Amino acid sequence: VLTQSPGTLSLSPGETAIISCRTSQYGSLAWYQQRPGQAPRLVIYSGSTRAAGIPDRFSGSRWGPDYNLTISNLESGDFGVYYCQQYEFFGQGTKVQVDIKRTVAAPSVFIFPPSDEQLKSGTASVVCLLNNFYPREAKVQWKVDNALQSGNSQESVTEQDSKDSTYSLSSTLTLSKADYEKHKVYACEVTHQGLRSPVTKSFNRGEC
Amino acid sequence: QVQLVQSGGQMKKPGESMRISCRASGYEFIDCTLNWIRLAPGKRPEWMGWLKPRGGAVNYARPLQGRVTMTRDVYSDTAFLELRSLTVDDTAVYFCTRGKNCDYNWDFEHWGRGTPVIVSSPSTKGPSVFPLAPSSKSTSGGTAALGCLVKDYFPEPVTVSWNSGALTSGVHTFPAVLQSSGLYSLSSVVTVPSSSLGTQTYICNVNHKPSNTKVDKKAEPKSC
Amino acid sequence: LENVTEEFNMWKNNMVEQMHTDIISLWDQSLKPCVKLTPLCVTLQCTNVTNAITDGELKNCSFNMTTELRDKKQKVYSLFYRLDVVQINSNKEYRLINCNTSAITQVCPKLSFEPIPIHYCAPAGFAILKCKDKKFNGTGPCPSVSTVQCTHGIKPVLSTQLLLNGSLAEEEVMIRSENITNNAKNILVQFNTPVQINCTRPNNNTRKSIRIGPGQAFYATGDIIGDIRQAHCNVSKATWNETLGKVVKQLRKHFGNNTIIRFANSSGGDLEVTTHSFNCGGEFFYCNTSGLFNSTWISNDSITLPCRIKQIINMWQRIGQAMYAPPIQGVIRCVSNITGLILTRDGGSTNSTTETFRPGGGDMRDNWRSELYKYKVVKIEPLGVAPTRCKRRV
Amino acid sequence: ITDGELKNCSFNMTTELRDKKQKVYSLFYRLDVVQINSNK
Amino acid sequence: NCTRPNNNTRKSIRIGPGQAFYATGDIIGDIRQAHCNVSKATWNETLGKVVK
Ligand SMILES: *[C@@H]1O[C@H](CO)[C@@H](O[C@@H]2O[C@H](CO)[C@@H](O[C@@H]3O[C@H](CO)[C@@H](O)[C@H](O[C@H]4O[C@H](CO)[C@@H](O)[C@H](O)[C@@H]4O)[C@@H]3O)[C@H](O)[C@H]2NC(C)=O)[C@H](O)[C@H]1NC(C)=O
Ligand SMILES: *[C@@H]1O[C@H](CO)[C@@H](O[C@@H]2O[C@H](CO)[C@@H](O[C@@H]3O[C@H](CO)[C@@H](O)[C@H](O)[C@@H]3O)[C@H](O)[C@H]2NC(C)=O)[C@H](O)[C@H]1NC(C)=O
Ligand SMILES: *[C@@H]1O[C@H](CO)[C@@H](O[C@@H]2O[C@H](CO)[C@@H](O[C@@H]3O[C@H](CO)[C@@H](O)[C@H](O)[C@@H]3O)[C@H](O)[C@H]2NC(C)=O)[C@H](O)[C@H]1NC(C)=O
Ligand SMILES: *[C@@H]1O[C@H](CO)[C@@H](O[C@@H]2O[C@H](CO)[C@@H](O[C@@H]3O[C@H](CO)[C@@H](O)[C@H](O)[C@@H]3O)[C@H](O)[C@H]2NC(C)=O)[C@H](O)[C@H]1NC(C)=O
Ligand SMILES: *[C@@H]1O[C@H](CO)[C@@H](O[C@@H]2O[C@H](CO)[C@@H](O[C@@H]3O[C@H](CO)[C@@H](O)[C@H](O)[C@@H]3O)[C@H](O)[C@H]2NC(C)=O)[C@H](O)[C@H]1NC(C)=O
Ligand SMILES: *[C@@H]1O[C@H](CO)[C@@H](O[C@@H]2O[C@H](CO)[C@@H](O[C@@H]3O[C@H](CO)[C@@H](O)[C@H](O)[C@@H]3O)[C@H](O)[C@H]2NC(C)=O)[C@H](O)[C@H]1NC(C)=O
Ligand SMILES: *[C@@H]1O[C@H](CO)[C@@H](O[C@@H]2O[C@H](CO)[C@@H](O)[C@H](O)[C@H]2NC(C)=O)[C@H](O)[C@H]1NC(C)=O
Ligand SMILES: *[C@@H]1O[C@H](CO)[C@@H](O[C@@H]2O[C@H](CO)[C@@H](O)[C@H](O)[C@H]2NC(C)=O)[C@H](O)[C@H]1NC(C)=O
Ligand SMILES: *[C@@H]1O[C@H](CO)[C@@H](O[C@@H]2O[C@H](CO)[C@@H](O)[C@H](O)[C@H]2NC(C)=O)[C@H](O)[C@H]1NC(C)=O
Ligand SMILES: *[C@@H]1O[C@H](CO)[C@@H](O[C@@H]2O[C@H](CO)[C@@H](O)[C@H](O)[C@H]2NC(C)=O)[C@H](O)[C@H]1NC(C)=O
Ligand SMILES: *[C@@H]1O[C@H](CO)[C@@H](O[C@@H]2O[C@H](CO)[C@@H](O)[C@H](O)[C@H]2NC(C)=O)[C@H](O)[C@H]1NC(C)=O
Ligand SMILES: *[C@@H]1O[C@H](CO)[C@@H](O[C@@H]2O[C@H](CO)[C@@H](O)[C@H](O)[C@H]2NC(C)=O)[C@H](O)[C@H]1NC(C)=O
Ligand SMILES: *[C@@H]1O[C@H](CO)[C@@H](O[C@@H]2O[C@H](CO)[C@@H](O)[C@H](O)[C@H]2NC(C)=O)[C@H](O)[C@H]1NC(C)=O
Ligand SMILES: *[C@@H]1O[C@H](CO)[C@@H](O[C@@H]2O[C@H](CO)[C@@H](O)[C@H](O)[C@H]2NC(C)=O)[C@H](O)[C@H]1NC(C)=O
Ligand SMILES: *[C@@H]1O[C@H](CO)[C@@H](O[C@@H]2O[C@H](CO)[C@@H](O)[C@H](O)[C@H]2NC(C)=O)[C@H](O)[C@H]1NC(C)=O
Ligand SMILES: *[C@@H]1O[C@H](CO)[C@@H](O)[C@H](O)[C@H]1NC(C)=O
Ligand SMILES: *[C@@H]1O[C@H](CO)[C@@H](O)[C@H](O)[C@H]1NC(C)=O
Ligand SMILES: *[C@@H]1O[C@H](CO)[C@@H](O)[C@H](O)[C@H]1NC(C)=O
Ligand SMILES: *[C@@H]1O[C@H](CO)[C@@H](O)[C@H](O)[C@H]1NC(C)=O
Ligand SMILES: *[C@@H]1O[C@H](CO)[C@@H](O)[C@H](O)[C@H]1NC(C)=O
Ligand SMILES: *[C@@H]1O[C@H](CO)[C@@H](O)[C@H](O)[C@H]1NC(C)=O
């Protein structure tokens, strides 16, 4: 009914930010600003009409079901969460995340098994450390036997860790021990701007 | 001046009534429609219902009927909202807004400060600490994920350290993955260099202070 | 007017709102000379009526009032409905309702209230248009326009949730709303056939009076000559059950197909908006209609609607105003027919399997917008130029 | 008070019921208060 | 410039059905008199113009 994308807007200040809805049914649209931890305020209304006290760097478009929000010259008071309402139904919220400019990064796929403390209990947990990433905008591909078998996991990232100004991505598994023998082949393939191909590195579990 | 002054905190426990209120000011109370929004964190916001003054005529959403109830006191300009049978998933902030003019409903010009109601349940969900072992004994130039996963802990928070704060830098504390059971599981990895793996038995020190316990386990390299 | 095509809009018409202004002015400028009841408030000890009663919804109170001399107490009594009596905290000490907020005025018991039809007429230099054609969802063009001096018969009848004594539709049930996807709006249905309703009450009450100051009189209820039974209101289950079929058929057309349509009663509010309120003969009823609307629709028997009666009312949902309705002698038997419904839709979850409609209310400006959707007031402009082949010779 | 130009009075008034006394009080300026002729 | 350090309160008393009398409540602070200030230079060289 209301679908917002992309969920993360990793942008630098001084830039332009684009956020887009796409509705189905006929009716007015508005955008609100969840300025983080305050009462939100109405940025655009009636589709493309600014509200009072809202600067001129904000406008809407376009034809048919499609809508945009433009944020020209992104400043500090604009990093927040952005909502899109149609009469009563909202959207899930997009996050405009701050990013400082860095040279492109060098990848590394580091996959390590769980310990013998609580592996034997009947559970399992395998991670994929993905150090030295830039940019934030990237896709994780936890490949098991050359097939995506992630399931209930989550691409849970940390911030741009300002000791190195880099990100660190991950992908996990929530499998039990009873069928853990199906997943002995592990691979992570992650691409970036400084990569012609997704990074990969085969690590056998017969070497401990 | 159109200012909607809310009232309260608060914390509750499950299965109890709750009652909040909006003292409206700056406009004719008896003439404009009010509204109610449930900004829960990390999720899609949700409108709950109206309340027309002058008649008291109400409308509610459909996933709330039999629990939500709205009413007003026209002599004190104070709307009220109640909700029976609160579950722990009813933690949010409850906002109480008003449109810009009094012709179109959904144009949320005015907002109120927020009334964050938080329901807490007695639930142990104690320590389940899964440290992550470096299989590399000492791989020169390699870096391991000397980390530690927590399985199905509740309630918030949960932390992790290593051998009484020996490993402080490189601790990429990943966010907690909310599993399908309604129980979150923390993941946390640490970049540790090659020779430092077998130098000391770095103990995964996960504090489980909401259950008043803690479990400390090591992540030594395996044998397979 | 052949070839004339105008465009109307029944929701931006201002004939409805200025009539609403002039209706509520008449009820206020008439009651200036109608006594009052400032001395009516008293501790008023009260018991239960002990008659042959099929049912504590009628009480036997007692109180002190001032006699002709303004120095001698006079202990009197009368009957009061359950809704007029409030407990404060042996035996029970009650307070009159709406003493702490407003001031109570007795409507003079010589003034008729009967809705006599109204004809609105335009003055000079104006004109009234009229859209005679059908299949008019209040907006858009109109191929059949005429010109009239006066609007047709309008009868100011202040009902809620169901339109009584209205004007029937032409061929089908006409459903009109500002926007159907907008939940904060009412839906007006209009019947092409009436459904008849009969409200009675076996009252057979009495009238007493108490002099309250020199030249003032308060009319109270005397005693009960007969038995006590509740009021009711009957509707037939065949003309009613095959009327909602017609309303479902036009509702199904907007929302689509394979839409389960549910009807359900009012979800909360003041007594004024969760009940139906009549005025038969000079009495004000409050009948429970949650049996007309309890139904689901896929793909000599009647219904008794119970009713409650109140004497201190507030017709216009205002602040600080009340009026006391005087009693009438005899049993009331009033026949009316229903021509329309005011509906409202519940918002909420996105399931295109079921929609649920409840009776709407809360506004008197919908009884009239159903009748003034035919007219539009224009303004005449007599001057005009055009070129010709004609020259003034000097 | 850096200054008897403001007084603390007390009086009987009628409550919601018009048969029960209600002893209330309020402040009055010196100019609103007149002496007629123990206490005053 | 006229001021007053009043900081008074407002009470009310219902006086009959539907009537209200607004009275003064209590004093939240101290009591000082009112006053009104004018400058002795713009004033003393204004009456010179009127005298003229
Ligand atoms: C619309 O219809 C619904 C039904 O679909 C209706 O909801 C019902 O309302 C009635 C009251 O109108 C509720 O009935 C109460 O039920 C409780 C049980 O939980 C009883 O204990 C209550 O008893 C009261 O009255 C007694 C005297 O009769 C007292 O002695 C006693 O102390 C209580 O005060 C009362 O009967 C009922 O819970 C709901 N719900 C259902 C599912 O029945 C709704 O009211 C209708 N809407 C309108 C505007 O009427
Ligand atoms: C209820 O109110 C809304 C608000 O105006 C009405 O929405 C408007 O509906 C019209 C007709 O569908 C839309 O116009 C059309 O838009 C499409 C876009 O592709 C275009 O192709 C057409 O040429 C025409 O422009 C209009 O966009 C729309 N307004 C908004 C803000 O979306 C709605 O129709 C009303 N409902 C009813 C039942 O009257
Ligand atoms: C409600 O209660 C009041 C008072 O409790 C009733 O009024 C009283 O009714 C009784 C009937 O037993 C009267 O008593 C008889 O009255 C006649 C004439 O007054 C007298 O000749 C008899 O000897 C006997 O006393 C009584 O007078 C009357 N009034 C008072 C002030 O007590 C009233 O009837 C009750 N309501 C109903 C509907 O009955
Ligand atoms: C809807 O319209 C009908 C038609 O006018 C109304 O019915 C009429 O209601 C009045 C109410 O006072 C009836 O008047 C009474 O008549 C009896 C016997 O005729 C008499 O004893 C009374 O003194 C009083 O005059 C009238 O008979 C009745 N029927 C007609 C005129 O045919 C009905 O009331 C309207 N509905 C509403 C809610 O107003
Ligand atoms: C308007 O009419 C509706 C429809 O009848 C009323 O709802 C009904 O009210 C009665 C009494 O309040 C309920 O009866 C009770 O039901 C329980 C069920 O276990 C039973 O144990 C009791 O002995 C008693 O019979 C009835 O259930 C209820 N609902 C229906 C029929 O669906 C409603 O109360 C009326 N509204 C007003 C404001 O008067
Ligand atoms: C002017 O005088 C009146 C009456 O002499 C003062 O009103 C009274 O103020 C006293 C303060 O000592 C109140 O006493 C205390 O009141 C509280 C709550 O009522 C109670 O919990 C204490 O135990 C104690 O009794 C007293 O209630 C209050 N009212 C009356 C009717 O006596 C008034 O304060 C004086 N004016 C100013 C500006 O203070
Ligand atoms: C009606 O008026 C009579 C007469 O004033 C009231 O009777 C008094 O009631 C009080 C209540 O405690 C007694 O203290 C007095 O002694 C009574 N006086 C007499 C002369 O009987 C009576 O209370 C008033 N109200 C009602 C409801 O009867
Ligand atoms: C006028 O008096 C009525 C007496 O019932 C008041 O109604 C009650 O007021 C209390 C106090 O706010 C509430 O807790 C109750 O729920 C009310 N209803 C009942 C049935 O007791 C009413 O509030 C008074 N008016 C004003 C303006 O205070
Ligand atoms: C309502 O009550 C009155 C009494 O107040 C009834 O009036 C009586 O009417 C009959 C004829 O029907 C006469 O014979 C009696 O003499 C009348 N009594 C009085 C005291 O005048 C009236 O009939 C009742 N109406 C009904 C039963 O509906
Ligand atoms: C209203 O409808 C009811 C529903 O049947 C009718 O019901 C019964 O009618 C007989 C015949 O007089 C009486 O003996 C019963 O007491 C009635 N029962 C009830 C619940 O009313 C009734 O006659 C109808 N009345 C009117 C005036 O329409
Ligand atoms: C509503 O009232 C009308 C008028 O009395 C009733 O219609 C009459 O009902 C009787 C049944 O006893 C028939 O004999 C008559 O032929 C009907 N028509 C007329 C013109 O009198 C109607 O039945 C009532 N509706 C109910 C009770 O639901
Ligand atoms: C409203 O709808 C409900 C649901 O069907 C009705 O409840 C049933 O009514 C029948 C007869 O009235 C009873 O035999 C059943 O026992 C009721 N259901 C239950 C679970 O008890 C209700 O009667 C309807 N009310 C009206 C006025 O139409
Ligand atoms: C006048 O008195 C009122 C109290 O009636 C003062 O109101 C307080 O204002 C402060 C902020 O300045 C708040 O923190 C307090 O909570 C208020 N008290 C109440 C009871 O609301 C007001 O500030 C005073 N104005 C002055 C000092 O000029
Ligand atoms: C009004 O004029 C007087 C005259 O000087 C000003 O006087 C003093 O100002 C100081 C500073 O606040 C205070 O400590 C004294 O108490 C004041 N004395 C008097 C007699 O007021 C005063 O500030 C002026 N105030 C205004 C508001 O104009
Ligand atoms: C009357 O009030 C005005 C406005 O406050 C005073 O003018 C200011 O006085 C202060 C002295 O504290 C200066 O700092 C400001 O520059 C003045 N001007 C403005 C625009 O604020 C004026 O002094 C007062 N007159 C008196 C006290 O006699
Ligand atoms: C009188 O009525 C009250 C409430 O209407 C009720 O509580 C009481 O039981 C009744 N008493 C008798 C004797 O009818
Ligand atoms: C009401 O209407 C439906 C559809 O016409 C029918 O199936 C049902 O039996 C009717 N009920 C009564 C009581 O007439
Ligand atoms: C809806 O159902 C009616 C049944 O008469 C049919 O004529 C109509 O074409 C249907 N519309 C759609 C969109 O299926
Ligand atoms: C509607 O009611 C009126 C008055 O009760 C009656 O005269 C009329 O015949 C009824 N039916 C109609 C207009 O179809
Ligand atoms: C109270 O005020 C009066 C006049 O204002 C004065 O005569 C009297 O002395 C005062 N008493 C006290 C105790 O302040
Ligand atoms: C007032 O005015 C006169 C004339 O200008 C001057 O002599 C005198 O000193 C002034 N006084 C003050 C207080 O300024």
Author numbering:
A (entry chain D): 3 to 27, 30 to 91, 96 to 216
B (entry chain C): 1 to 52, 52A, 53 to 82, 82A, 82B, 82C, 83 to 100, 100A, ...
C (entry chain A): 86 to 136, 148 to 184, 186 to 309, 312 to 323, 323a, 324 to 396, 405 to 406, 412 to 505
D (entry chain I): 149 to 184, 186 to 189
E (entry chain I): 295 to 309, 312 to 323, 323a, 324 to 347
Source paper text:
Host cell entry of HIV-1 is accomplished by the envelope glycoprotein (Env) spike. The gp120 segment binds the primary receptor CD4, triggering conformational changes leading to the binding of co-receptor CCR5/CXCR4 that causes global rearrangements in the trimer structure leading to viral and cell membrane fusion and gp120 shedding. In the pre-fusion, closed state, typical of SOSIP trimers, the gp120 domains surround a bundle of three gp41 helices, protecting conserved fusion elements of the trimer. In this study we combined structural and mechanistic information to construct a mutant Env that is no longer responsive to triggering by the CD4 receptor.
The F14 mutations consisted of the layer-1 mutation V68I, layer-2 mutations A204V and V208L, and the outer-domain mutation V255L. The results for the F14 construct indicated that sCD4 triggering of the open state is nearly eliminated based upon the lack of 17B response together with a ~11-fold reduction in 19B response. To understand the structural basis for the observed lack of CD4-induced conformational rearrangements, we determined structures of the F14 SOSIP trimer in complex with VRC01 and the F14/Vt8 SOSIP trimer in complex with VRC03 and 10-1074 via single particle cryo-electron microscopy (cryo-EM). A total of 77,632 and 84,378 particles yielded final map resolutions of 3.0 Å and 2.9 Å, respectively. However, map densities in the C-terminal portion of HR-1 in both F14 and F14/Vt8 trimers displayed a helical extension of the buried three helix bundle toward the trimer apex, a feature that resembles the extension observed in open and partially open SOSIP structures. As a result of this gp41 restructuring, residue K567 displaced W571 from the layer-1/layer-2 pocket that was formed by residues F43, C54, W69, T71, A73, C74, D107, L111, and T217. Interestingly, the F14 map displayed layer-1 loop densities suggestive of multistate behavior. Specifically, density corresponding to H66 and H72 in a configuration similar to that of the F14/Vt8 structure appeared alongside additional distinct densities, which may correspond to differing H72 sidechain configurations. The first strategy that led to the F14 series of mutations identified the conserved W571 as a conformational switch and effectively disabled a communication network that relied on the movement of topological layers 1 and 2 to transmit structural changes from the CD4 binding site.
